[PDB]
């Protein structure tokens, strides 16, 4: 059970790393408000073409 | 009869001790079985991860 | 991922608390259970030797009752003629 | 009670047999002639003793 | 689609960890040991 808890801690670190990658990748696709050049110009649909 | 009582004091509890040993070792080996099963889950997710 | 972690966590505390869904009437005769100790005590008080066939408790005790009715009538045979 | 306990003993015998095959794949037919003879000797010795626990 | 694949894998992991909890929490025996069980009718016939 001690080794089991240590390896569940390892897999919990893996899950936290997965959540870290997910949060890292959110900001490219939550980037819908490109009304300025200051913000990283990620997607064209986040702009206004007018 | 006195030393028969002395022997029966262990005769009553020997089956309980064997049951405790068997149940505790089964619930101890299911920890290792769980560890293997969700190691399998770990490596099922980890390569796609 | 958090639900998977919660599944692992809820698997952790369920380990300390192996009960098989088998017929319990025979299983309660096993001396490891406290009901087994109760049945062996019933065998002690019914004249059955310890560790014997627990299923012969009812045939023996009724036979004891068959012995019981095999006594009191003789009591009358020792009383009314008395 | 005798009929009930006979049905109960059948159920427990089947459960313990299935436990035997699922644990160590053990059946009464696997033992040899001397093993089956020792098993039957303990069986009818316990019949003569009308006991439930086969511990020494 | 690439994220949905891992969503499917994690949902599979969650359900295979769901299916293990109910087996260890089965109230088969439903102090019950002190009292005479009505299912154990042998003891009831003995008392009668």
Q: List the determination method.
A: cryo-EM
Q: Which among A5, A8, A19 has the least Cβ separation from residue C1?
A: A19
Give the number of other Cβ atoms within 10 Å of residue D47's Cβ: 10
Q: Which chain D residue's Cα is nearest to E41? A: D1
Q: How far is C26 from chain D (nearest CA, A)?
A: 7
Q: Which has the closest alpha carbon to D29: D15, D40, D44?
A: D40
Do A and B touch, 3+ Cβ pairs within 8 Å? The answer is: yes
**Interface check B34 vs C, CB under 8 A:** yes
Nearest to C8 by CA among B47, A17, E8, B34: B34
Q: Tell me whether E17 touches chain C (CB under 8 Å).
A: yes
Find the DSSP H helices in chain A. Answer: 2-29
Check D52 against C29: CB less than 8 A apart: yes
Q: Within chain E, how many helices (H) and strands (E) appear?
A: 2, 0
To the nearest 10 degrees (0 to 180), the angle between helices B2-46 and C2-13 is: 170
Interhelix angle C2-13/E2-18, nearest 10 degrees: 10
Nearest to C23 by CA among E24, E46, D9, D17: D9
E17: closest chain B residue by CA: B38
Q: Are D36 and D28 in contact (CB under 8 A)?
A: yes
B6–chain C nearest CA distance, Å: 15
Q: What is the CA E22 to chain-centroid distance, rounded?
A: 4
Tokens, residue A35: 């009304």
- For residues C61 and E45, the answer to whether their CB atoms sit within 8 Å is no
Q: How far is the C-alpha of C9 from the C-alpha of C2, rounded, in Å?
A: 10
Q: Which residues of E10-38 are buried (b: 16+ CB within 10 A; e: fewer)?
A: beebeeebeeeeeeeeeeeeeeeeeebbe
Q: Does C10 touch chain A (CB under 8 A)?
A: no
- B44 has a chain E CB within 8 A of its CB: yes
Chain E contact for C55, CB < 8 A?
yes
Provide the chain E residues 8-37 that lie in CB contact (below 8 A) with chain D: none
């Amino acid at each position: 059970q001690g080794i089991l808890n240590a390896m569940i801690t390892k897999i919990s670190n893996e899950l936290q790393a997965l959540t870290d990658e997910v949060t890292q990748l959110m900001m490219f696709f939550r980037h819908s408000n490109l009304g300025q050049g200051t913000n990283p110009l990620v997607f064209l649909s986040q702009f206004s073409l007018e | 009869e006195l030393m028969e009582r002395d022997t029966e004091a262990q005769d009553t509890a020997m089956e309980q001790a064997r049951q405790h040993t068997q149940d505790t070792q089964r619930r101890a080996l299911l920890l290792r079985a769980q560890a293997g099963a969700m190691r399998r889950q770990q490596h099922t997710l980890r390569d796609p991860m | 991922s958090r639900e998977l972690l919660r599944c692992l966590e809820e698997e952790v505390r369920h380990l300390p608390h192996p009960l098989p869904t088998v017929l319990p009437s025979i299983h309660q005769l096993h001396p490891a259970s406290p009901r087994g100790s109760s049945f062996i005590a019933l065998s002690h008080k019914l004249g059955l030797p310890p560790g014997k066939a627990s299923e012969l408790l009812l045939p023996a005790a009724a036979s004891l009752r068959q012995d019981l009715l095999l006594l009191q009538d003789q009591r009358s045979l020792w009383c009314w003629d008395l | 009670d005798l009929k009930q306990k006979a049905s109960e003993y059948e159920s427990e015998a089947k459960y313990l047999q299935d436990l035997l095959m699922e644990s160590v794949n053990f059946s009464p037919a696997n033992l040899s002639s001397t093993g089956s003879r020792y098993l039957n000797a303990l069986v009818d010795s316990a019949v003569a003793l009308e006991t439930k626990d086969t511990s020494l | 689609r690439q994220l949905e694949n891992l969503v499917q894998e994690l949902s599979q992991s969650n359900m295979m960890l769901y299916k293990q909890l109910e087996m260890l929490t089965d109230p088969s025996v439903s102090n019950p040991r002190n009292t005479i069980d009505t299912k154990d009718y042998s003891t009831h016939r003995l008392y009668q």
